[PDB]
PDB file of all heavy atoms in Angstrom:
ATOM      1  N   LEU S  14      16.921  36.472  10.355  1.00  0.00           N
ATOM      2  CA  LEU S  14      17.353  35.086  10.419  1.00  0.00           C
ATOM      3  C   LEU S  14      18.789  34.993   9.913  1.00  0.00           C
ATOM      4  O   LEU S  14      19.304  33.904   9.654  1.00  0.00           O
ATOM      5  CB  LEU S  14      16.425  34.228   9.559  1.00  0.00           C
ATOM      6  CG  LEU S  14      16.332  32.730   9.859  1.00  0.00           C
ATOM      7  CD1 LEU S  14      15.107  32.135   9.179  1.00  0.00           C
ATOM      8  CD2 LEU S  14      17.599  32.014   9.423  1.00  0.00           C
ATOM      9  N   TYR S  24       5.828  34.919  22.444  1.00  0.00           N
ATOM     10  CA  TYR S  24       4.676  34.065  22.726  1.00  0.00           C
ATOM     11  C   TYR S  24       4.162  34.250  24.146  1.00  0.00           C
ATOM     12  O   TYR S  24       4.939  34.267  25.099  1.00  0.00           O
ATOM     13  CB  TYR S  24       5.045  32.595  22.515  1.00  0.00           C
ATOM     14  CG  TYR S  24       3.870  31.657  22.288  1.00  0.00           C
ATOM     15  CD1 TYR S  24       3.902  30.706  21.271  1.00  0.00           C
ATOM     16  CD2 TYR S  24       2.735  31.719  23.087  1.00  0.00           C
ATOM     17  CE1 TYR S  24       2.838  29.842  21.057  1.00  0.00           C
ATOM     18  CE2 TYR S  24       1.662  30.859  22.877  1.00  0.00           C
ATOM     19  CZ  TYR S  24       1.721  29.924  21.861  1.00  0.00           C
ATOM     20  OH  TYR S  24       0.661  29.068  21.651  1.00  0.00           O
ATOM     21  N   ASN S  29       0.617  37.140  20.570  1.00  0.00           N
ATOM     22  CA  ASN S  29       1.969  37.019  20.055  1.00  0.00           C
ATOM     23  C   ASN S  29       2.364  38.322  19.376  1.00  0.00           C
ATOM     24  O   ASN S  29       1.534  39.218  19.222  1.00  0.00           O
ATOM     25  CB  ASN S  29       2.074  35.841  19.085  1.00  0.00           C
ATOM     26  CG  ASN S  29       1.838  34.506  19.767  1.00  0.00           C
ATOM     27  OD1 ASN S  29       1.808  34.422  20.996  1.00  0.00           O
ATOM     28  ND2 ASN S  29       1.672  33.455  18.970  1.00  0.00           N
ATOM     29  N   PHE S  32       8.706  38.361  15.587  1.00  0.00           N
ATOM     30  CA  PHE S  32       9.880  37.800  16.242  1.00  0.00           C
ATOM     31  C   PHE S  32      10.987  38.833  16.426  1.00  0.00           C
ATOM     32  O   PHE S  32      11.307  39.592  15.510  1.00  0.00           O
ATOM     33  CB  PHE S  32      10.397  36.562  15.498  1.00  0.00           C
ATOM     34  CG  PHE S  32      10.073  36.542  14.027  1.00  0.00           C
ATOM     35  CD1 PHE S  32      10.566  37.517  13.178  1.00  0.00           C
ATOM     36  CD2 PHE S  32       9.285  35.531  13.494  1.00  0.00           C
ATOM     37  CE1 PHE S  32      10.273  37.491  11.826  1.00  0.00           C
ATOM     38  CE2 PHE S  32       8.989  35.502  12.146  1.00  0.00           C
ATOM     39  CZ  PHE S  32       9.483  36.482  11.311  1.00  0.00           C
ATOM     40  N   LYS S  67       9.749  27.754  25.578  1.00  0.00           N
ATOM     41  CA  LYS S  67       9.050  26.491  25.761  1.00  0.00           C
ATOM     42  C   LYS S  67       9.193  25.668  24.489  1.00  0.00           C
ATOM     43  O   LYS S  67       8.469  24.696  24.274  1.00  0.00           O
ATOM     44  CB  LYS S  67       7.569  26.727  26.058  1.00  0.00           C
ATOM     45  CG  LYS S  67       6.721  25.466  26.008  1.00  0.00           C
ATOM     46  CD  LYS S  67       7.083  24.509  27.133  1.00  0.00           C
ATOM     47  CE  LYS S  67       8.584  24.287  27.219  1.00  0.00           C
ATOM     48  NZ  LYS S  67       9.304  25.503  27.690  1.00  0.00           N
ATOM     49  N   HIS S  80      15.347  30.504  14.715  1.00  0.00           N
ATOM     50  CA  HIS S  80      13.883  30.519  14.706  1.00  0.00           C
ATOM     51  C   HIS S  80      13.323  29.939  16.003  1.00  0.00           C
ATOM     52  O   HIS S  80      12.905  28.782  16.040  1.00  0.00           O
ATOM     53  CB  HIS S  80      13.337  29.744  13.504  1.00  0.00           C
ATOM     54  CG  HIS S  80      13.931  30.162  12.194  1.00  0.00           C
ATOM     55  ND1 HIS S  80      14.826  29.377  11.500  1.00  0.00           N
ATOM     56  CD2 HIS S  80      13.763  31.284  11.456  1.00  0.00           C
ATOM     57  CE1 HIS S  80      15.181  29.998  10.387  1.00  0.00           C
ATOM     58  NE2 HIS S  80      14.552  31.157  10.338  1.00  0.00           N
TER      59      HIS S  80
ATOM     60  P     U Y  76      -0.969  30.109  10.974  1.00  0.00           P
ATOM     61  OP1   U Y  76      -1.503  30.302   9.606  1.00  0.00           O
ATOM     62  OP2   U Y  76      -0.122  28.930  11.274  1.00  0.00           O
ATOM     63  O5'   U Y  76      -0.129  31.403  11.390  1.00  0.00           O
ATOM     64  C5'   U Y  76      -0.785  32.595  11.805  1.00  0.00           C
ATOM     65  C4'   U Y  76      -0.063  33.214  12.983  1.00  0.00           C
ATOM     66  O4'   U Y  76      -0.214  32.385  14.157  1.00  0.00           O
ATOM     67  C3'   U Y  76       1.449  33.317  12.847  1.00  0.00           C
ATOM     68  O3'   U Y  76       1.812  34.386  11.966  1.00  0.00           O
ATOM     69  C2'   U Y  76       1.846  33.565  14.300  1.00  0.00           C
ATOM     70  O2'   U Y  76       1.816  34.933  14.667  1.00  0.00           O
ATOM     71  C1'   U Y  76       0.785  32.782  15.082  1.00  0.00           C
ATOM     72  N1    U Y  76       1.323  31.589  15.835  1.00  0.00           N
ATOM     73  C2    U Y  76       2.128  31.801  16.947  1.00  0.00           C
ATOM     74  O2    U Y  76       2.442  32.905  17.356  1.00  0.00           O
ATOM     75  N3    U Y  76       2.577  30.661  17.571  1.00  0.00           N
ATOM     76  C4    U Y  76       2.304  29.351  17.219  1.00  0.00           C
ATOM     77  O4    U Y  76       2.779  28.434  17.883  1.00  0.00           O
ATOM     78  C5    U Y  76       1.456  29.206  16.056  1.00  0.00           C
ATOM     79  C6    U Y  76       1.007  30.304  15.425  1.00  0.00           C
ATOM     80  P     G Y  77       2.752  34.133  10.686  1.00  0.00           P
ATOM     81  OP1   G Y  77       2.634  35.309   9.796  1.00  0.00           O
ATOM     82  OP2   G Y  77       2.479  32.779  10.147  1.00  0.00           O
ATOM     83  O5'   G Y  77       4.221  34.117  11.313  1.00  0.00           O
ATOM     84  C5'   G Y  77       4.750  35.266  11.969  1.00  0.00           C
ATOM     85  C4'   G Y  77       5.865  34.867  12.914  1.00  0.00           C
ATOM     86  O4'   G Y  77       5.318  34.114  14.018  1.00  0.00           O
ATOM     87  C3'   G Y  77       6.886  33.917  12.317  1.00  0.00           C
ATOM     88  O3'   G Y  77       7.895  34.646  11.659  1.00  0.00           O
ATOM     89  C2'   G Y  77       7.455  33.200  13.535  1.00  0.00           C
ATOM     90  O2'   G Y  77       8.634  33.798  14.037  1.00  0.00           O
ATOM     91  C1'   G Y  77       6.331  33.287  14.557  1.00  0.00           C
ATOM     92  N9    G Y  77       5.771  31.973  14.849  1.00  0.00           N
ATOM     93  C8    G Y  77       4.456  31.608  14.739  1.00  0.00           C
ATOM     94  N7    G Y  77       4.230  30.370  15.061  1.00  0.00           N
ATOM     95  C5    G Y  77       5.475  29.878  15.410  1.00  0.00           C
ATOM     96  C6    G Y  77       5.845  28.583  15.848  1.00  0.00           C
ATOM     97  O6    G Y  77       5.110  27.604  16.011  1.00  0.00           O
ATOM     98  N1    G Y  77       7.215  28.482  16.096  1.00  0.00           N
ATOM     99  C2    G Y  77       8.110  29.518  15.943  1.00  0.00           C
ATOM    100  N2    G Y  77       9.391  29.246  16.228  1.00  0.00           N
ATOM    101  N3    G Y  77       7.773  30.736  15.533  1.00  0.00           N
ATOM    102  C4    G Y  77       6.441  30.849  15.286  1.00  0.00           C
ATOM    103  P     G Y  78       8.749  33.947  10.504  1.00  0.00           P
ATOM    104  OP1   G Y  78      10.018  34.702  10.389  1.00  0.00           O
ATOM    105  OP2   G Y  78       7.849  33.835   9.333  1.00  0.00           O
ATOM    106  O5'   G Y  78       9.039  32.460  11.045  1.00  0.00           O
ATOM    107  C5'   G Y  78      10.346  32.033  11.452  1.00  0.00           C
ATOM    108  C4'   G Y  78      10.358  30.627  12.039  1.00  0.00           C
ATOM    109  O4'   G Y  78       9.063  30.266  12.581  1.00  0.00           O
ATOM    110  C3'   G Y  78      10.642  29.484  11.069  1.00  0.00           C
ATOM    111  O3'   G Y  78      12.030  29.412  10.710  1.00  0.00           O
ATOM    112  C2'   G Y  78      10.178  28.276  11.883  1.00  0.00           C
ATOM    113  O2'   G Y  78      11.147  27.792  12.796  1.00  0.00           O
ATOM    114  C1'   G Y  78       8.992  28.848  12.656  1.00  0.00           C
ATOM    115  N9    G Y  78       7.685  28.365  12.192  1.00  0.00           N
ATOM    116  C8    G Y  78       6.889  28.863  11.185  1.00  0.00           C
ATOM    117  N7    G Y  78       5.773  28.200  11.020  1.00  0.00           N
ATOM    118  C5    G Y  78       5.828  27.195  11.979  1.00  0.00           C
ATOM    119  C6    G Y  78       4.905  26.159  12.289  1.00  0.00           C
ATOM    120  O6    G Y  78       3.812  25.917  11.756  1.00  0.00           O
ATOM    121  N1    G Y  78       5.363  25.355  13.340  1.00  0.00           N
ATOM    122  C2    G Y  78       6.562  25.532  14.006  1.00  0.00           C
ATOM    123  N2    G Y  78       6.858  24.674  14.993  1.00  0.00           N
ATOM    124  N3    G Y  78       7.430  26.495  13.722  1.00  0.00           N
ATOM    125  C4    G Y  78       7.001  27.286  12.705  1.00  0.00           C
ATOM    126  P     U Y  79      12.517  29.571   9.185  1.00  0.00           P
ATOM    127  OP1   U Y  79      13.640  30.537   9.180  1.00  0.00           O
ATOM    128  OP2   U Y  79      11.339  29.814   8.319  1.00  0.00           O
ATOM    129  O5'   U Y  79      13.071  28.115   8.809  1.00  0.00           O
ATOM    130  C5'   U Y  79      14.204  27.529   9.456  1.00  0.00           C
ATOM    131  C4'   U Y  79      14.085  26.013   9.499  1.00  0.00           C
ATOM    132  O4'   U Y  79      12.983  25.656  10.374  1.00  0.00           O
ATOM    133  C3'   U Y  79      13.764  25.334   8.168  1.00  0.00           C
ATOM    134  O3'   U Y  79      14.955  25.071   7.403  1.00  0.00           O
ATOM    135  C2'   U Y  79      13.026  24.074   8.624  1.00  0.00           C
ATOM    136  O2'   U Y  79      13.899  23.044   9.051  1.00  0.00           O
ATOM    137  C1'   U Y  79      12.229  24.587   9.824  1.00  0.00           C
ATOM    138  N1    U Y  79      10.784  25.027   9.573  1.00  0.00           N
ATOM    139  C2    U Y  79       9.736  24.255  10.062  1.00  0.00           C
ATOM    140  O2    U Y  79       9.886  23.219  10.686  1.00  0.00           O
ATOM    141  N3    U Y  79       8.473  24.739   9.790  1.00  0.00           N
ATOM    142  C4    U Y  79       8.146  25.894   9.096  1.00  0.00           C
ATOM    143  O4    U Y  79       6.971  26.203   8.929  1.00  0.00           O
ATOM    144  C5    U Y  79       9.278  26.650   8.620  1.00  0.00           C
ATOM    145  C6    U Y  79      10.515  26.197   8.874  1.00  0.00           C
ATOM    146  P     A Y 107       0.835  23.561  26.394  1.00  0.00           P
ATOM    147  OP1   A Y 107       0.724  23.735  27.858  1.00  0.00           O
ATOM    148  OP2   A Y 107       0.138  22.425  25.747  1.00  0.00           O
ATOM    149  O5'   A Y 107       0.360  24.914  25.671  1.00  0.00           O
ATOM    150  C5'   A Y 107       0.872  26.189  26.081  1.00  0.00           C
ATOM    151  C4'   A Y 107       0.316  27.355  25.270  1.00  0.00           C
ATOM    152  O4'   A Y 107       0.381  27.142  23.834  1.00  0.00           O
ATOM    153  C3'   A Y 107      -1.156  27.660  25.479  1.00  0.00           C
ATOM    154  O3'   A Y 107      -1.401  28.220  26.779  1.00  0.00           O
ATOM    155  C2'   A Y 107      -1.393  28.637  24.324  1.00  0.00           C
ATOM    156  O2'   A Y 107      -0.963  29.961  24.580  1.00  0.00           O
ATOM    157  C1'   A Y 107      -0.561  28.003  23.203  1.00  0.00           C
ATOM    158  N9    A Y 107      -1.359  27.248  22.228  1.00  0.00           N
ATOM    159  C8    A Y 107      -1.228  25.919  21.923  1.00  0.00           C
ATOM    160  N7    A Y 107      -2.067  25.488  21.012  1.00  0.00           N
ATOM    161  C5    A Y 107      -2.810  26.610  20.691  1.00  0.00           C
ATOM    162  C6    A Y 107      -3.873  26.816  19.779  1.00  0.00           C
ATOM    163  N6    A Y 107      -4.381  25.851  19.004  1.00  0.00           N
ATOM    164  N1    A Y 107      -4.396  28.062  19.697  1.00  0.00           N
ATOM    165  C2    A Y 107      -3.890  29.031  20.474  1.00  0.00           C
ATOM    166  N3    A Y 107      -2.896  28.955  21.363  1.00  0.00           N
ATOM    167  C4    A Y 107      -2.389  27.707  21.429  1.00  0.00           C
TER     168        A Y 107
END
Side-chain angles (χ1 to χ4, degrees):
Chain S
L14 203 164
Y24 201 134
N29 295 348
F32 27 62
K67 169 67 311 69
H80 308 108

